C-alpha cells in the first residue's frame, strides 16, 4: 500500500494539469539549507537561567520548553525569535537556496497555492529566484492586501519571522490552533473542498500534522453528510522511510504514501517535483 | 513552585469540606493491581498477522497500533477489548484491590463525583468494598437512568469494559474526543465551573491529559469573558517526580503540583488521601 | 398530538418522583405580577433622542432597539437596566408574588434545579416565601461559591438584575449565546443528558427558545452517535393556545405540548403544578 | 475666623448675582431623606461569607470592606450597588424629598452648575420638583450629549446609580481619583479657575474631601505661577460644628467656614440657601 | 480620506446647531492682515549683537532664537514683544480686518467659545466689528472676572499682547506648556469632553499643534477607560494642501481633514464659515 | 492568605542572595528605643496658646495639629522639630539601640538600600555600631555627594532631623508627597522596577503607607502596559496582628503579609531578620 | 562658552574617578558601522503601496511615515523592524565594530551605567569584545532579572531589536514617551539626581533630545524646591559643529558643549574617551 516514484508521477501530473495540487511543505524541506535546530538555540539561551544545555533539553519537548520561556522569562522567548530570524534567513542560507535542487524544482512549476509550516522565507525566495512573484499570507492584514491572480499565494501556516506575533511555537499556541480559527486555518477549510495536497518533509511521529491529517478527513466527510457520498481527490505524502503500519493508517485519512529513495534525501524529492512537470 | 504533602493537606481539606473536590484518576492509580500493559496484549495479537512482538511495537504508539487493528483486521480489535475485560477485571485483580491502601483511602471519603480515565471497574469496586454505593456513568443511557443523591457518581471518561462501544482506545477516537462532545465531556464542561480537580496517576509526557489541562483552563477563562475576572479554585496534580520546568507550565493552567515521596509510590498516594479526611 | 391536564399529570409525576424534572420558566410566568413591558420602557427613554414612543417602536424588535442604545447612546442602555430593576423587583411586585397561585404551587414542590429566562427575582423569591432556600446562579462567581445539597439551584439563563453585566438583552448578546458558551449554557449541556424539561410561559413565535429547543435535541442525538439509539425522557411545554401545526414540529424536538385551559391563564398553570404533587 | 449666617449672606449673594457660585453637596445633604447607611448594607451582605455584622465592620473602613468584595466575591459588590439603587432612590425617599426644606431652597435658585458626591438622584430630582430642567453628567457619554444653555448641569462627582460602572466606592477607585483624570475631575479643573464653591454636608474627618480641598488650592496657585499673584474668589464650607483648629487650616485652602445653628440641622441649611435669594 | 467643502458643510452644521463646535484658529487665519513675520523682527534686533539678519536666522528655529534673547539679552526679548504689539495690532491691521471676508464670516455666527493661538487682537476685534461682545481669556485674573452668558469667550491659548507675561514664545515656554497646566490648558481639558473642534490655519509640519492633536485624543480615550467605549464627536482641520499621508494620521487622532480650494486661500476659508450658517 | 515565620524565611532568603530585598522601616521599628510620642510633644507646646493637652489633641490628627502650628504660630513648629532632635537622638536612645536585637539583626546583613520613614538616626546608627558604613540620603545635596559602592545607602523617605527643611510632618507636606516628586520619591520610582520590599513597623490604619502601597502597584502595572504581562517580585509586610480582611487587600497590591508572634514584639522581628541570614 | 578637548578632559576625569559619569549615546555613535539609514529602508517598503521612494519621503518625517505604517499597513511596520534587525546587527557591522576606535575607547573604561537611544546591539557588543560583561535593560522583565554589581548596565532608552515591542519608532510612541513613564524613563529619573551625563552623537535640530535636555533640567530644579539651591554636576555634550547660539541655550540646561575636531569625526570622539582614562 505504498506508491513508488514512477507510480505516483502520473497521479500527481493529473492533479497538476487541472490546477488542483497544493504542496504542504514541512521542516524537512529546509533540511539542505543547513539551518540551526532551534532546540540547540533554546538550550543556549537557558545558560542565563542556570541550566546546562543537555540538562535543559531533558525537561520536555521543544514546544514545552518554549512554553517555559513564555511564562517565566518572556524576554528570552523574544530573543529566541530574534536569533532565529538572523539564522534561518541569513545570507548563507540564501546561497544554499540558490543551488538547492529541491527549491529549483519547486519553483519550476506554476503553482497557485503553496502551504508551508516552517518560519523561514525560503519557500517564497525560491520563487523569487526563478523570476516568479509570490505573496506571503500569514496575518489578517496580508489577506486584505491586493494582489494579482497570476501570483502564487504562499500561506505561512505557522507564521513568518517578519511578523513575530504570528509565530506558532509555544505549546499553548499549538493547542489553540487545533480549533482551526486562525486565518491560515480558515483558508485551509475552503481549499480542502476542491484540492489535493502533497505533504513533503514530515515524520510519522510529529503528532501535530497527524491531527491536521485527521481533521482534514473529518471536514471532507462532514461536507457530504446529507448528499450521497462521492469520491474525493487523494492526497499524497512523500517519505523516505515509510515503515509498515503507518501507510495503512494514512490511507484511511485520504492520503497515499510515496516511497522515495532513501540514499540521497534531497535528490529523490527533486526527482518527484520534476516528474510533475 | 511545588507543594509537599503537609503543605497541600489543608488546601485539599478546605475544598473537601464544602464538597468541591473531584478526583481525576489515571492509569497510575491501577498500578498496584498488577494488570497487564495492553501494549503487551496488542503485541501478542499481532503474531497472527506475521509480526514479532518487539517488531510490531516499533511501528508506532499504542493508540496508533490500535488504529491499525480498527481498519485492517477489526476482529482483532474486538479480541483486544475482550481479553482486557478478562484481565483487568479478573478475580486476582479484585483480591489486590481489597488490600490496596490507595483504594481503601479513596473509599473512606464521601465523594460526590469521581472521574477516571482507565477502563477497569476498580474505582467503583473500591467503593463497593467499603459498603458504599456507586453509579457508573459512561454512555447516554447511564445518565438517563435514575439514582439517589447520596450515591457517588463515577464517570468513566474513556468508557467502560462492560460497554465496549464507549471505549476510547483507537487513535481516531482520541482525536474526536478533543472536540469535547461525548456525554462524559459535557458533564466535565459543567463541573469545571464549580469544582476543583485532583489529578492522580498521570505523567507529564502523556499529551492527552495535557490537552485536557489546557482546555479546562480555556473554558474557565471563556466563562468570565464579559464579567470582571474573579479568582478560580486551584486544581491539583499529585506526582512522584515533578521535574523542574513542567510545574511552572501547570501553574498557568490553574494546577498546583504536589510532590509525593518517590520511595514507595502506593504509600505516598495513600497518605495524601488520608490527610483529606 | 396534544396532551391535556389529566393526561400529562401522571407523566409529570413519574419524572418528579425520581428527581428528573426541571422547570424552564419564561416571561409568561411573571405575567400576574403586573410588570412593565420593557418595550414601553425603552420607548420612553427614546424621547431624549427625539423619538415619539410609537415611532421608535416601528424601527425594529425590542432586542434590535436595545442594540441601538448599546452603540449610539450607552448611558441610556444602563438607564434601561436601572429602571427595570426598580420596576421588576419593586415592593408592589413582591406583594402580588405572595398571593400568586402560580408562584405558590411552584414553591410547594422540592425542586433540585429551576431554569428561568426572565431577569426578575420572583422565581427565587417564591421559594423564600415558602421557607425554602434558593441559590442564584448567573455568573462564574456564583457557581464557584459554596452551598448545601438541599438548596434548590435557580439558574438565571439570561442573567440577573443584581449582576448587570450578565444581562442578555442586546441583539448581539442573543446571537453570541447561540454558541452556548456562557456558564448557564454549560450547565444546560450536562442537565439535558439526565433530565426532562418543563417549559412554561413561552410562545411559538419567540425564535430564541425555538433555537434552544432545536439545539437540545441535536445535543441529545449527538450524545448517542456511536452507541445504539436509546429512548430519551420526553420534555414538556405547557400552552394555553397550542395551534394545529406547531405541536407536531415540537414532537420531533422531544417535546410534548400540554394544552391548558385558556379561560383563566394563571389558574390553569397552577392546576398543572399542583397535579405534580 | 468663622462666619455666621448673617455675615456670610451678603458674601454668598455677591457671588450668586454674577453667576460664580457652585454648590458642592455631600452625604449630609441627603440626611433628611432617611436613607440606609451603606455600612449597614455591606454588613448584612457579609452574612453569606460567615461574618457577623458587628464583626465584619471591625476589619476596616467602608471603602476598605468594599475593596474586599471587589476582589474576593465580586457578585456581592454588584449586589451592593443593586440594593442601594432600590433604597436610595425609592418612592419613600422621593416623598421626603418633596417636603424637605433643604431641597426646596436649593431648587428655588437658578444655578448653572451643581456638584455632588452622593450616588442618589435627589439633587436633580429636587430641580424636577420645582419645574426646572437638570442634566446629569457622570460619564463621557453624558458630556457628549446635547443640551440647552438654560439647563442646570448637575455633575455627579462620584458616579450615579443608573450608570453602575461610574460608581466610586471601592478603596482603589478612591485612590485613582486622586490623580484627577475622570471626566468629573476634568470639569472641576476648569471650574476652579472662574468660580467659588459652597461645600455643604461634609465632616472635617473625611480625608477624601480634604485632599480635594488641598488640590483645588494647589491648582489655583499653579495657574498663576508666572503672572503676578492676584486675589481669588473665596470658597465656603457650611458646618454645624466648626471646632477650633480646623477653620484656621481651611482658611489657607481658600475656604471660609460658616457656622450654622446646630439645634436643627436641616433648618439652618435651608436658611442659608434662602438668604442667597 | 479627505472631505471637500460640500461634504463637510452638513457635518459642521450639525455640530453648530447644538452648540458643540469650537474654532481653533492658527497663524494662517491672520494671513490677510499683512502682519510682519516675527522672524524678520527678531533678526533685525540681532544687529545690535553683531549678527547679520540672514546669519542669525541660520542658528535655529524662531522659538530657539527667542530662547537666546531670554537668557543672554533679556531687554531685547521685551523689545520684541513691544514692537510686535505696535505691528500686529496697528491701525493698518484693523483696516484690513474690517474688509477681510474670513473675519466677517467668523463673526456672522453666534459662537460660544473660540480658541486661538496667535497673539494679536483680531479674533475678538472681528466680533466687535459685527456689534457682538467678546471676552478675552488669557490669565487667571481674566477667568475670575464677571461676564454674561451671551458673551462669546475667546481664549488666547498662547497669551495676549496686552498681558506680556502670558506670551508663550520662548522655547522653554513651549516645552512647559506640554504638561498642560496653564489656565488656557485647564479650560481645554474640560471642553474636549463635550465639543468638536475646527482647526483653521495650521500646517502639518508645526510639531506643536501635533502634540496638542495627540494629547486631545489621549485625554478622550483616558476619559472612558472603565466604561464601555462610546463614539466621540469628530474634530475637523481645514487645509489647502492636504498631502497624501498626513490625513490618514490625523484620522486616528479623531480629526477629519477638509480640503479647501488652494487657488484663493482667503476665499475658500470664507466659504467654509458661511456654509455653517 | 498569610505567611508564618518559617514559611516566609526561604522566600526572603531567595530575594536577599541576589540582592533584590529592600527594607522599608516604619515607626514601629523605633518602638524599643522608648522615644517620646510626638503627639505628647505637640500637646505640651500648646500650653502657651491656652490649650489643655487633652483638649488640643481632640481637634484633629497629629499632622493636622502640626498644620495649625505651620500657619498660626510658626516658631512653635520649629520648636517641635528642635525638641524631637534632642529626644529622638539622645544618648539614652543610643544606649538602647546598642542592645536592641532588632537593630543588631538588621545590621548583621549586607544590605544595599534601606528605606525608612522615621526621622531619627537609629537606622544608620545601627549600621555604624556593627562597624559598617552608611550613607544618609534625604535631600538633593545628599545624592550629589560622592560615595563608594560598598556603602549601604539609607534613604530617609520623610526627611532627617539634621536637615530640618526635609521633614515631612505638616499635613500639607504629606499631601504634596502624594505626587511623588521629592528626591526620595524619584529614587523609589526606579527601585520598584527591580526590587522586592520588606515593610516592617506599620499598621493597617495608617492611610499614608496605604497610598504608597497602592501607588507602587500602579507603577508596576504601568511599566508593562505595552509588553506582555510578566510576573513581578512579591513584596512583604511583617505584622503582629494581621486581621482577617486586610491581608486579602494587600495581596492584590503585590504584598504578602507575614504573621509574627505577638507575645514579644521585638523578639519576633529579630527572628525574622536572622532567618534571612 | 564652548570647551575644547584639553579643557574638558580634567572635567570629565573628575566625574569618572568618583563614578558619576554616564554616557548617553546617540545615532552618531553608530556612524562608523556603515548601517543603513532606515529612511532608505522605509522608502523601499513603500513600493508595494504604489509610492516612488523619493515621493514617499516627501510626505513627512521618518517617525511620521512610520506612523502611516502603524495604522494603514501594520504588516509593513513589522517588516521594517525585521529588516533593521538583519541590517543593524549583521556580521559586517560586527566586524567594523571590532576595529572602531570609538567602540574600543568606550569599552576601555569601567562604566557603571551607559545610556543609548539607538536600537542596535553595538554598545553592549563593544563591551563584550573587551572581555567585559554587560546587562541589557529595555523592558520590565530585564530589570527584574538578577545580575552582579560588577556588570555595567546598558539601558536601551528607545528599545532593543530583540524585544520588538519595546521599539520607540512610531510618532505616537515618541509623544507618549514625553510623559516619562517607561522603565528606561523611571531609571533616568533617579540617575539625574546623582550623576553627570555625557551626550555623544546628537544634533541640535533633533527636537526629541532637546525635550529630554529641558526635562532633565526641570527635574533637577524640582528636586530642590524647598531646600536651599545647591550647585549640581554639569552635564556635557560633545559636538563637531557647535554653532554660535545653541551652546548658550544648552548652558542654561546644565549642559556644557565640547567642541571636537571636525576633520575626522570618529578620531576626535575616540580622543575624548581616551582622555577620561
mmCIF file of N, CA, C and O in Angstrom, chain F residues 174-219:
data_model
loop_
_atom_site.group_PDB
_atom_site.id
_atom_site.type_symbol
_atom_site.label_atom_id
_atom_site.label_comp_id
_atom_site.label_asym_id
_atom_site.label_seq_id
_atom_site.Cartn_x
_atom_site.Cartn_y
_atom_site.Cartn_z
ATOM 1 N N UNK F 174 2.393 66.149 53.670
ATOM 2 C CA UNK F 174 2.015 64.782 53.322
ATOM 3 C C UNK F 174 1.205 64.738 52.035
ATOM 4 O O UNK F 174 1.320 63.784 51.257
ATOM 5 N N UNK F 175 0.371 65.750 51.799
ATOM 6 C CA UNK F 175 -0.444 65.774 50.591
ATOM 7 C C UNK F 175 0.384 66.043 49.341
ATOM 8 O O UNK F 175 0.076 65.500 48.275
ATOM 9 N N UNK F 176 1.426 66.862 49.438
ATOM 10 C CA UNK F 176 2.243 67.141 48.267
ATOM 11 C C UNK F 176 3.298 66.075 48.016
ATOM 12 O O UNK F 176 3.919 66.082 46.949
ATOM 13 N N UNK F 177 3.515 65.163 48.962
ATOM 14 C CA UNK F 177 4.325 63.985 48.692
ATOM 15 C C UNK F 177 3.536 62.871 48.024
ATOM 16 O O UNK F 177 4.130 61.856 47.651
ATOM 17 N N UNK F 178 2.222 63.034 47.859
ATOM 18 C CA UNK F 178 1.438 62.048 47.128
ATOM 19 C C UNK F 178 1.648 62.146 45.625
ATOM 20 O O UNK F 178 1.325 61.197 44.905
ATOM 21 N N UNK F 179 2.175 63.268 45.137
ATOM 22 C CA UNK F 179 2.508 63.408 43.728
ATOM 23 C C UNK F 179 3.810 62.714 43.360
ATOM 24 O O UNK F 179 4.071 62.536 42.165
ATOM 25 N N UNK F 180 4.611 62.336 44.361
ATOM 26 C CA UNK F 180 5.897 61.649 44.214
ATOM 27 C C UNK F 180 6.881 62.456 43.363
ATOM 28 O O UNK F 180 7.292 62.044 42.279
ATOM 29 N N UNK F 181 7.267 63.616 43.888
ATOM 30 C CA UNK F 181 8.219 64.484 43.215
ATOM 31 C C UNK F 181 9.465 64.781 44.035
ATOM 32 O O UNK F 181 10.369 65.452 43.526
ATOM 33 N N UNK F 182 9.539 64.312 45.276
ATOM 34 C CA UNK F 182 10.711 64.513 46.106
ATOM 35 C C UNK F 182 11.856 63.619 45.627
ATOM 36 O O UNK F 182 11.625 62.635 44.924
ATOM 37 N N UNK F 183 13.101 63.960 45.962
ATOM 38 C CA UNK F 183 14.238 63.070 45.641
ATOM 39 C C UNK F 183 14.166 61.693 46.294
ATOM 40 O O UNK F 183 14.662 60.734 45.685
ATOM 41 N N UNK F 184 13.596 61.506 47.504
ATOM 42 C CA UNK F 184 13.333 60.113 47.910
ATOM 43 C C UNK F 184 12.245 59.441 47.095
ATOM 44 O O UNK F 184 12.241 58.209 46.991
ATOM 45 N N UNK F 185 11.326 60.207 46.512
ATOM 46 C CA UNK F 185 10.265 59.610 45.710
ATOM 47 C C UNK F 185 10.780 59.177 44.346
ATOM 48 O O UNK F 185 10.337 58.159 43.805
ATOM 49 N N UNK F 186 11.698 59.952 43.765
ATOM 50 C CA UNK F 186 12.235 59.614 42.453
ATOM 51 C C UNK F 186 13.159 58.411 42.529
ATOM 52 O O UNK F 186 13.278 57.658 41.558
ATOM 53 N N UNK F 187 13.820 58.218 43.669
ATOM 54 C CA UNK F 187 14.614 57.017 43.879
ATOM 55 C C UNK F 187 13.724 55.794 44.052
ATOM 56 O O UNK F 187 14.090 54.694 43.623
ATOM 57 N N UNK F 188 12.544 55.973 44.649
ATOM 58 C CA UNK F 188 11.598 54.875 44.805
ATOM 59 C C UNK F 188 11.007 54.441 43.470
ATOM 60 O O UNK F 188 10.696 53.258 43.290
ATOM 61 N N UNK F 189 10.866 55.374 42.525
ATOM 62 C CA UNK F 189 10.307 55.056 41.213
ATOM 63 C C UNK F 189 11.195 54.107 40.421
ATOM 64 O O UNK F 189 10.691 53.308 39.626
ATOM 65 N N UNK F 190 12.508 54.178 40.616
ATOM 66 C CA UNK F 190 13.416 53.285 39.912
ATOM 67 C C UNK F 190 13.675 51.992 40.666
ATOM 68 O O UNK F 190 13.963 50.969 40.038
ATOM 69 N N UNK F 191 13.582 52.010 41.995
ATOM 70 C CA UNK F 191 13.843 50.806 42.767
ATOM 71 C C UNK F 191 12.690 49.817 42.737
ATOM 72 O O UNK F 191 12.924 48.621 42.923
ATOM 73 N N UNK F 192 11.460 50.268 42.492
ATOM 74 C CA UNK F 192 10.353 49.325 42.393
ATOM 75 C C UNK F 192 10.373 48.534 41.094
ATOM 76 O O UNK F 192 9.655 47.535 40.988
ATOM 77 N N UNK F 193 11.170 48.952 40.111
ATOM 78 C CA UNK F 193 11.283 48.212 38.864
ATOM 79 C C UNK F 193 12.082 46.927 39.020
ATOM 80 O O UNK F 193 11.891 45.996 38.232
ATOM 81 N N UNK F 194 12.964 46.849 40.013
ATOM 82 C CA UNK F 194 13.910 45.749 40.110
ATOM 83 C C UNK F 194 13.895 45.002 41.433
ATOM 84 O O UNK F 194 14.461 43.908 41.497
ATOM 85 N N UNK F 195 13.270 45.534 42.474
ATOM 86 C CA UNK F 195 13.481 45.050 43.827
ATOM 87 C C UNK F 195 12.171 44.603 44.460
ATOM 88 O O UNK F 195 11.081 44.951 44.003
ATOM 89 N N UNK F 196 12.301 43.820 45.523
ATOM 90 C CA UNK F 196 11.194 43.483 46.400
ATOM 91 C C UNK F 196 11.382 44.204 47.727
ATOM 92 O O UNK F 196 12.510 44.443 48.165
ATOM 93 N N UNK F 197 10.272 44.555 48.361
ATOM 94 C CA UNK F 197 10.286 45.399 49.544
ATOM 95 C C UNK F 197 9.813 44.623 50.764
ATOM 96 O O UNK F 197 8.911 43.786 50.670
ATOM 97 N N UNK F 198 10.433 44.905 51.903
ATOM 98 C CA UNK F 198 10.082 44.303 53.187
ATOM 99 C C UNK F 198 9.610 45.422 54.107
ATOM 100 O O UNK F 198 10.423 46.171 54.654
ATOM 101 N N UNK F 199 8.296 45.534 54.275
ATOM 102 C CA UNK F 199 7.699 46.585 55.087
ATOM 103 C C UNK F 199 7.609 46.106 56.531
ATOM 104 O O UNK F 199 6.928 45.117 56.816
ATOM 105 N N UNK F 200 8.289 46.802 57.438
ATOM 106 C CA UNK F 200 8.326 46.435 58.849
ATOM 107 C C UNK F 200 7.974 47.660 59.680
ATOM 108 O O UNK F 200 8.598 48.715 59.530
ATOM 109 N N UNK F 201 6.985 47.521 60.552
ATOM 110 C CA UNK F 201 6.678 48.538 61.529
ATOM 111 C C UNK F 201 5.547 49.477 61.187
ATOM 112 O O UNK F 201 5.607 50.649 61.570
ATOM 113 N N UNK F 202 4.522 49.008 60.488
ATOM 114 C CA UNK F 202 3.377 49.823 60.127
ATOM 115 C C UNK F 202 2.101 49.190 60.660
ATOM 116 O O UNK F 202 2.083 48.040 61.102
ATOM 117 N N UNK F 203 1.027 49.965 60.614
ATOM 118 C CA UNK F 203 -0.308 49.482 60.921
ATOM 119 C C UNK F 203 -1.174 49.574 59.674
ATOM 120 O O UNK F 203 -0.860 50.297 58.726
ATOM 121 N N UNK F 204 -2.278 48.826 59.682
ATOM 122 C CA UNK F 204 -3.169 48.836 58.532
ATOM 123 C C UNK F 204 -4.002 50.105 58.448
ATOM 124 O O UNK F 204 -4.549 50.399 57.384
ATOM 125 N N UNK F 205 -4.119 50.859 59.539
ATOM 126 C CA UNK F 205 -4.920 52.075 59.570
ATOM 127 C C UNK F 205 -4.068 53.330 59.442
ATOM 128 O O UNK F 205 -4.380 54.358 60.053
ATOM 129 N N UNK F 206 -2.993 53.270 58.658
ATOM 130 C CA UNK F 206 -2.074 54.397 58.579
ATOM 131 C C UNK F 206 -2.536 55.434 57.563
ATOM 132 O O UNK F 206 -2.329 56.635 57.769
ATOM 133 N N UNK F 207 -3.099 54.975 56.434
ATOM 134 C CA UNK F 207 -3.693 55.734 55.323
ATOM 135 C C UNK F 207 -2.682 56.561 54.528
ATOM 136 O O UNK F 207 -3.047 57.186 53.529
ATOM 137 N N UNK F 208 -1.420 56.565 54.943
ATOM 138 C CA UNK F 208 -0.333 57.147 54.171
ATOM 139 C C UNK F 208 0.512 56.078 53.503
ATOM 140 O O UNK F 208 0.862 56.211 52.329
ATOM 141 N N UNK F 209 0.841 55.013 54.235
ATOM 142 C CA UNK F 209 1.545 53.897 53.632
ATOM 143 C C UNK F 209 0.605 53.091 52.743
ATOM 144 O O UNK F 209 1.067 52.385 51.842
ATOM 145 N N UNK F 210 -0.713 53.211 52.942
ATOM 146 C CA UNK F 210 -1.658 52.531 52.064
ATOM 147 C C UNK F 210 -1.701 53.173 50.688
ATOM 148 O O UNK F 210 -1.900 52.473 49.689
ATOM 149 N N UNK F 211 -1.535 54.494 50.613
ATOM 150 C CA UNK F 211 -1.433 55.141 49.312
ATOM 151 C C UNK F 211 -0.131 54.766 48.621
ATOM 152 O O UNK F 211 -0.101 54.600 47.399
ATOM 153 N N UNK F 212 0.949 54.625 49.391
ATOM 154 C CA UNK F 212 2.229 54.203 48.832
ATOM 155 C C UNK F 212 2.152 52.757 48.353
ATOM 156 O O UNK F 212 2.700 52.410 47.301
ATOM 157 N N UNK F 213 1.444 51.903 49.099
ATOM 158 C CA UNK F 213 1.238 50.517 48.683
ATOM 159 C C UNK F 213 0.410 50.432 47.408
ATOM 160 O O UNK F 213 0.665 49.577 46.551
ATOM 161 N N UNK F 214 -0.591 51.301 47.271
ATOM 162 C CA UNK F 214 -1.372 51.354 46.042
ATOM 163 C C UNK F 214 -0.535 51.866 44.881
ATOM 164 O O UNK F 214 -0.569 51.304 43.781
ATOM 165 N N UNK F 215 0.209 52.944 45.109
ATOM 166 C CA UNK F 215 0.895 53.639 44.031
ATOM 167 C C UNK F 215 2.095 52.851 43.519
ATOM 168 O O UNK F 215 2.443 52.967 42.341
ATOM 169 N N UNK F 216 2.719 52.030 44.371
ATOM 170 C CA UNK F 216 3.755 51.119 43.891
ATOM 171 C C UNK F 216 3.182 50.070 42.949
ATOM 172 O O UNK F 216 3.820 49.712 41.953
ATOM 173 N N UNK F 217 1.990 49.555 43.259
ATOM 174 C CA UNK F 217 1.356 48.567 42.393
ATOM 175 C C UNK F 217 0.946 49.188 41.067
ATOM 176 O O UNK F 217 1.031 48.540 40.019
ATOM 177 N N UNK F 218 0.493 50.441 41.097
ATOM 178 C CA UNK F 218 0.084 51.114 39.873
ATOM 179 C C UNK F 218 1.278 51.417 38.978
ATOM 180 O O UNK F 218 1.169 51.330 37.752
ATOM 181 N N UNK F 219 2.429 51.740 39.569
ATOM 182 C CA UNK F 219 3.631 51.980 38.785
ATOM 183 C C UNK F 219 4.258 50.700 38.252
ATOM 184 O O UNK F 219 4.988 50.757 37.259
#
